Amino acid sequence: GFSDLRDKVVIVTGASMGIGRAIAERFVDEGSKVIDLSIHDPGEAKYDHIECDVTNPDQVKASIDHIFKEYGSISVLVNNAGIESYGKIESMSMGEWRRIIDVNLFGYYYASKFAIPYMIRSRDPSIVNISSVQASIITKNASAYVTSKHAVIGLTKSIALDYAPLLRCNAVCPATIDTPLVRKAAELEVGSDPMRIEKKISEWGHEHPMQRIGKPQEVASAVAFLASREASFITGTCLYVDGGLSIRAPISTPE
């Protein structure tokens, strides 16, 4: 693992399930003091939790102020909380489109804005933003989601440039990962049949050169690496955890 993460205060947003929970658990395994900021209670977890809606800047500020007071520092912030709904720009209501931007982009902006002042009071703090392989190659009927993930890359570069060399900021760009959100995405297409869901997921996995979809722990490994001193000269970039998806053209060749 990354020994330097031990005992450091790590905040992870949206860590009650899926990738966020996997990230929180990895940091706990690294020995960090982890706090989850989410609207849902992670239940019996080894990490701390504060009820917090990332779209509410006042609650985000209060939660972060509380963490600094309780723990004495903040060394790592992982922005992960996000949502996805589908629809053509003409079908999705303007409210829902804006809501996706609010959670996926503004949530990252608020958490970063309020954590940074405290983070720079620590040695070599690091922010990791979870974007998507869709910051590059995109899906249909996902206007708001795709727009928000591209925005996250811009926010990431900005924070990196504005605060270097004291604080580093990078993003992780995952492709299809085995999470509740993805299983739900499949159900929205094939129904509740566990057999038919495995088929749709297998189809997606076969589209990735690695021939399977990713695991939450694989995204968590990239986050831990970027948050650690092992990435001391890495800032402003997105580490793609996509099983090769973003470099594959879907055009057959003779074999």
Q: Would you call the peptide bond into 165 cis, given omega within 30 degrees of 0 as the criterion?
A: yes
Nearest residue to 239 (alpha-carbon basis) of 181, 178, 175? 175
Vertex 180 angle, CA 217 and 60, to 5°: 80
Q: Is 135 helix (H, G, I), strand (E, B) or coil?
A: helix
86 binds, among ligand BMA, a copy of itself, none (CB under 5 to 8 A by kind): a copy of itself
The burial of 85, by beta-carbon neighbours within 10 Å (0-12 exposed, 13-18 middle, 19 or more buried), is given as middle
Q: With binding defined as CB under 6 A, does residue 175 bind ligand BMA?
A: yes
Q: With binding defined as CB under 8 A, does residue 31 bind a copy of itself?
A: no
Vertex 237 angle, CA 63 and 128, to 5°: 20
Tokens of 196: 């038919």
Among 94, 233, 249, 254, binds ligand BMA (CB under 6 A): 249
Site string for ligand BMA, 82-101 (x = CB under 6 A): --x-----------------
Among 176, 221, 228, 235, binds ligand BMA (CB under 6 A): 176
Q: Nearer Cβ to a copy of itself, position 43 or 165?
A: 165
Phi-psi region of 35 (alpha: psi -120 to 50; beta: other; left: phi over 0): beta
Q: Is 193 within any annotated ligand binding site?
A: no
Q: Is 67 within any annotated ligand binding site?
A: no
Show Cβ contacts of residue 39 under 8 Å, excluding neighbours closer than 6 positions: 51, 52, 53
Among 16, 79, 132, 228, binds ligand BMA (CB under 6 A): 132
CA pair distance 50, 27, nearest whole angstrom: 17
71 binds, among a copy of itself, ligand BMA, none (CB under 5 to 8 A by kind): none
Check if 145 is active-site: yes
CA pair distance 54, 102, nearest whole angstrom: 9
Site string for a copy of itself, 92-121 (x = CB under 8 A): --x--xx--x---xx--xx-xx--xx----
Which of these segments, 6-14, 29-37, 130-138, 225-233, binds ligand BMA (CB under 6 A)? 130-138
Check 109, 110, 118, 145 and give the catalytic one. 145
Q: With binding defined as CB under 8 A, does residue 218 bind a copy of itself?
A: yes
Q: Is 38 helix (H, G, I), strand (E, B) or coil?
A: strand
Annotated binding site for NADH: 16, 19, 53-54, 80, 82, 108, 145, 149, 177, 179
Return the active site residues.
Answer: 145
Which residues contact ligand BMA (rule: CB under 6 A)?
84, 132-134, 175-176, 182, 204, 245, 249, 251
